[PDB]
Write a protein that binds this ligand. Sequence first.
Ligand SMILES: *[C@@H]1O[C@H](CO)[C@@H](O[C@@H]2O[C@H](CO)[C@@H](O)[C@H](O)[C@H]2NC(C)=O)[C@H](O)[C@H]1NC(C)=O
Ligand SMILES: *[C@@H]1O[C@H](CO)[C@@H](O)[C@H](O)[C@H]1NC(C)=O
Ligand SMILES: NC(=[NH2+])NCCC[C@H](N)C(=O)O
Ligand SMILES: [Cl-]
Ligand SMILES: [Cl-]
Ligand SMILES: [Cl-]
Ligand SMILES: [Cl-]
Length: 701
Amino acid sequence: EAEFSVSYDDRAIIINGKRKILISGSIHYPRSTPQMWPDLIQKAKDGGLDVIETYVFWNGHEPSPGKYNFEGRYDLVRFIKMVQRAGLYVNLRIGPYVCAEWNFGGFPVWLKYVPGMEFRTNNQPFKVAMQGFVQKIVNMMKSENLFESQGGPIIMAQIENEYGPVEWEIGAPGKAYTKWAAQMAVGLKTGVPWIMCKQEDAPDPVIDTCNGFYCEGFRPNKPYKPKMWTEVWTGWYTKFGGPIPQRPAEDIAFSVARFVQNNGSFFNYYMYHGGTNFGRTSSGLFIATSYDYDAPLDEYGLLNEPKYGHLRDLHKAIKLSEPALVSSYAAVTSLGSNQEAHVYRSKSGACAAFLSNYDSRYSVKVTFQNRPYNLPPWSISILPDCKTAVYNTAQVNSQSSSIKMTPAGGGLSWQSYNEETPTALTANGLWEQKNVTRDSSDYLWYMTNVNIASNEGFLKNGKDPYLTVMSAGHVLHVFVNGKLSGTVYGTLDNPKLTYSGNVKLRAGINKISLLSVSVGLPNVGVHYDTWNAGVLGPVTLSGLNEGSRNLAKQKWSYKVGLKGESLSLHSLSGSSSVEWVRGSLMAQKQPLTWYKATFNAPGGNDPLALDMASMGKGQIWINGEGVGRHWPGYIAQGDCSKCSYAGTFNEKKCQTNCGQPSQRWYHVPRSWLKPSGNLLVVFEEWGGNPTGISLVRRSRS
Ligand SMILES: *[C@@H]1O[C@H](CO)[C@@H](O[C@@H]2O[C@H](CO)[C@@H](O)[C@H](O)[C@H]2NC(C)=O)[C@H](O)[C@H]1NC(C)=O
Ligand SMILES: *[C@@H]1O[C@H](CO)[C@@H](O)[C@H](O)[C@H]1NC(C)=O
Ligand SMILES: NC(=[NH2+])NCCC[C@H](N)C(=O)O
Ligand SMILES: [Cl-]
Ligand SMILES: [Cl-]
Ligand SMILES: [Cl-]
Ligand SMILES: [Cl-]
């Protein structure tokens, strides 16, 4: 007989023979640093979590076919072992489609270009690659007994991610792929359950699970499977150009209690720590570098009060109730028009009760077992012994905290290095951007010649012809004869672009150079991997004798990435290899400019950020390591109004920061610094003043 095991029944996941009501939170290992992990995990433990949930990030682990990375913050095994050291379990969401507001949904970009490839359907090249990667991860975990069946922390794993809605659209090949994925995963023999989220048709023995702001009405697809909520959304993601979304602690607590009172036995906060999209292969399409998510642990790892403590107290109440929860089922008694008691009374006498008020506007005082309980609107009281309420989801006993970002160390000494604008790797017509760059850089130059006859009407009348450039996105800079004519940029929902303007041209050869920029790759949507980036046109020049010229129907030239990228200006060795501009000649408010400075690490233990308010858009490195994209120049658009915790939440309900830079502060991990001589390199795409950049220390108070 196995010493350790995981099974399940209609009531719960069963660990080493005992039913458990499992409290879980998401922490994505590459969204923080190995130095942070033990602290984050400890905070989760102290916050009442039994489980840490994480995706596996394929694109990070396999940057080219058969070449793997498990180093640094991609050391998945190290992360899993740290969770185990804290006495927590793991839900390993392998995918390898993970969505996750993460570049290309987790797929390596090279995968797209394998002959005969089609993503997320019953496609042979896809299935071979997917099976190979999932098998590799499973075998890595098994090699060190990391599944609970072997004494390790992993108690379940997920195959795919929210595939149900994809099948709905693509039909039978989707049904066939689902069946294949489930049987393939189960056949890897992990010794523990497999799950699929948002997958009503998940075949036995896979447990299908629920995601959302609320999941109280969800039931799995067989009565002998437990009821599990894989993503309790704790807020929403921040997009560049969007506001900062919040979700009230009282509403999260209500949603969790609503699920647990209805036989729910596993729930996981997405995110518990959200963290940061470091570098340039992390963020999904238009996703901000901050992945804060209004999580119980903020981007920097600090306690987000009062949410952290309010959920901590909810968890204590659930723990007090657990012996009753696992030895009975929820029995409903009506209390009033929109009020109920869900009671868990065991054969032995243990009793826990949940008293609910679903009215979003009014308080109701109910009588339960001869005692009065007042229930604020949209709240649930928990009585772990059916006698005394120890917690109510709308009564927050934790003190709130606000953010302070305090400058530290003052201003730095800057040097600059200019990018050049290249001019007319060629083609007759326009190529899609991912195809050309393979996502090796955000930047692709599209270049062409425009010949102008001496007899053009506009030349003799002193007017300018009219240029229209249409692009699939995501940012476009239009240069005409070496001069920037305009910049256009999209939104997450609409990344496509149109530049249109009068442009000055002369007799003979004119140069048009387009700098096309991606800002993370799409990560969700049926066939999202087929969506274009870059300039596919139409591209037209009107106001000519001929009428309008189709500029797509001529020779185009291509240049992948920036000169500074080729030179590795982000690194100490690369930046030191060239001479930079110093002194009063420092480039100011100039597009396509690299900046560098050296700084000493601030003392103490407060988390750190760069204040980038004086800058525009680009990328940041510290000691050669990518801090992430900056885009303070993208002002937050949306509706920001007072919200109440009460009533059905949606991601736009409690938005803040409207009309302000969508992200101003950029997280710098402490462990990336040395005491002295830290190299800071900023590529500035749009234009800024580097003198305004400072380090800040973050505190909560
Ligand atoms: C918790 O689960 C129990 C047991 O499945 C549910 O009670 C059963 O409900 C089904 C209908 O779905 C009935 O056919 C059974 O007769 C019920 N059994 C018992 C012992 O009452 C119960 O509905 C669930 N609780 C809630 C509130 O969802
Ligand atoms: C992709 O680039 C190749 C050259 O490698 C070219 O043959 C093809 O037409 C391009 N397709 C698109 C859609 O850009
Ligand atoms: N307010 C609600 N309970 N809405 C229904 C939630 C649906 C749930 N998230 C699901 O996907 O099945
Ligand atoms: Cl996760
Ligand atoms: Cl790292
Ligand atoms: Cl097994
Ligand atoms: Cl760190």
